[PDB]
Subunit: 245 residues, 4 copies
Amino acid sequence: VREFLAEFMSTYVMMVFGLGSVAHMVLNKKYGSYLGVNLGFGFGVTMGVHVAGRISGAHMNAAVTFANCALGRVPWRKFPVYVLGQFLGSFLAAATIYSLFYTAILHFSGGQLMVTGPVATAGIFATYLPDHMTLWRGFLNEAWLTGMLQLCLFAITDQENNPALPGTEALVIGILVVIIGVSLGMNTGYAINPSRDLPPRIFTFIAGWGKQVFSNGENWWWVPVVAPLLGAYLGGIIYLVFIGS
Amino acid sequence: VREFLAEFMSTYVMMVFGLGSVAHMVLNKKYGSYLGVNLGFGFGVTMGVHVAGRISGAHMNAAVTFANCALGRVPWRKFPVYVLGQFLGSFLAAATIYSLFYTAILHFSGGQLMVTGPVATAGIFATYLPDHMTLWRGFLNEAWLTGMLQLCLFAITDQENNPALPGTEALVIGILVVIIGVSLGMNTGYAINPSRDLPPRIFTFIAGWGKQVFSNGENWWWVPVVAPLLGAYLGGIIYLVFIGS
Amino acid sequence: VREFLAEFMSTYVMMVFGLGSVAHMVLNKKYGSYLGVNLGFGFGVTMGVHVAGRISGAHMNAAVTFANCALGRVPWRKFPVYVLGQFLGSFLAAATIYSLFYTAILHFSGGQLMVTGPVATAGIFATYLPDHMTLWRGFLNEAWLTGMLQLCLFAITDQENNPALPGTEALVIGILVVIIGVSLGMNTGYAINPSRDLPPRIFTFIAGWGKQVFSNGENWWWVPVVAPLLGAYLGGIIYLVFIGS
Amino acid sequence: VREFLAEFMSTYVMMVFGLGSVAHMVLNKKYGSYLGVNLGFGFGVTMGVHVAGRISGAHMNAAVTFANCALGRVPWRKFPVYVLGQFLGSFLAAATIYSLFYTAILHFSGGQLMVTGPVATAGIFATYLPDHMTLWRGFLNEAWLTGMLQLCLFAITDQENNPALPGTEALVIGILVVIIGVSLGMNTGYAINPSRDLPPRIFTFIAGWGKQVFSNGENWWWVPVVAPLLGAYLGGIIYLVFIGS
């Protein structure tokens, strides 16, 4: 199916720019930036939309695919093909960054693929909640942040309201992902996307970071998987209730 | 009225991206930035305009609503419905950030919701003028800065002059709010919006910051409420006098 | 003449965002930035073009007015009316920033309007070349940098080549002024505009900074006045020779 | 041939904004930035596309010219004329920055044009791989990074898929070069362009930096020349296989 390779290609490109920006922020502090993370993932989404926006819609996100189907906009038969396409692309993008930044991660870490400590590198690929946070509040943040993403996504592409001019939606959508990081990313790393979080964390477990990538943060791994699903659905519902009312 | 929920939805979204960016700048200095505050509020306005620009005009600002009515552009009957819509949305967005950043504010402040000191957090939600400033100069800044906002807003949307191409005004308007922060925000925190300032400060008084959120800065709270009203009106007048002359 | 007030209004707005960004960089280092200076002047130009692009062309720059007339594009009779319009607007924008940042400049400087020392403030309004530079190389930089501005301006607005889509030229032009600062501003402060430099420096001499604002840097003041005139003309010539060849 | 001067003019402009941004990052740390390097080269590409996008396509890059010809999109006879046009423009842009930043480089370096040490300046013009890297991994990075550039370039300009709206492709293309730096530039300096790397390094050898500009990094100079050629070709192939499948 053409929507499989479209979701694969757009998610791969998006995650390369994304996870590469995060690797920059962690590895070097003269070449890395939290703002660069916001820009790398944001405008990384802009490139993916140019890749697959006209073929599959360029979801690059299992939450917005789940929310579109659960809202009667995409047939339920296309949910597995969309999810596996972005899961495979995100997995391969994690392997891409790991190999491109290999000696950079090695020299920085001295050869220790660590998840805790002042030299940890697991946070490049997946999300790990800071020490000041609780798992329930991380669920609340991921749900609310994905809700903001879905509500704002509908408004940018709503041809019956006030959408971005066609041919520029790629810009406005990337800017939304930029400011979601700038304004809401410190508390959880704004995963807002199961395809962005679980495939790279699965890669880190196989790569050699071990099993603590899953158990860190009171078994944190499942929250970026199900919390955005509830968030994206809730966000889309509130817009559709806001629209026509 | 549809313009009530439109102003509510756009102001809520705008203030979430706004107050979240400010929380970042205060809480963490590796994930926060004054430029991020400029971007979070700026492109936060961009998302609100996509939400309500075609339904209500996406004022998200009692000064531009007051200036539009006082300039004979919006009927005076729509002033209370617009103001309460953005006041309620801004109030709820302040409660949204407080709950999402709850333990972040607690761990940073040790459990003390303070307004002064090296660990104060009241400045996340509302404006507090720096020690080098006077209340009269804060009135002058808020009036002049809102005047710049209203004059520039008219120019960006003036279909009879040189406006932004339709479908891209959301971008240009956000950029205006970005540079108002970059170029003019240090002296007062560029409130430029009664709906942005008073509802979150009222929330901080109820949340537990106490009554000093109102008395700080020689009873500073009323200036972001009335000074932008005079500024936006003056700014719009000078453009309309500049136009057709 | 309508082009007088258009050049006045657009230059005033541009210089408020410009000189305010520079004041930020000098006064506070948590709220100020060299990148913010690049953004404040860059997208400040974007707002001016929306003000006067359709009425006068939004020159906001005596070099591009001189280059347009000397290239047979604007009648020579409109050179004095354009220059005095932007000179008056830039002068009043310098007075605007000085009054808005008054106590900020006073508290930072302790009450001393100084041009040298670790607490100087004259550099907010006009340009002063660093100690590592020579006056001849400052002439070379201002000429080459204005040449880049004029050549790139023609390309962005050349309806017979590859211009920015109408209604978005304000964006692309501001971005050009951003990167001229980012890439070429350290050596001279990229004045690239007599209207940007001389009127604010004249204001600083009257405001109380004294006469060293003119004599600093081996009588530096005249270079941002005549060097951009030669630069803009040369830059425009090379494009017009490049076009149709 | 008009495509010669078009490639010359666009590459010259692009490299002036590019190499000037890098000079900023190296020479001063209050006026320079790695993000500024990303912006200077990124939106420098935006200006070049406005110069030559409609005349020659604004390649400004021997890898994308090689990839276009090897993919049957540009006649093979136009490969030498395109390459020498951008090589000459990039060479002259390197001489432009060296003369504009002359005393800045001299005062910073005390008069020593050095390639190693805490005061080296050769990295302004060409790429030098960090100490934590291997030459083979630098080949892998330059190939993969140019592949990302070519794949994303096709998607932005594919009139049969989801391209940027005509008249705005200059913006989206520059943004792509920005995030390639933000997300992937630390490991190699993302040369992604033989015309960007070899001509300035040849200039540094003649300027007086000596022969170590070529021998540094296990004879690093040839990798930015041939690795992007393989990368751009591979990236374009994968898109064209992705398209229509």
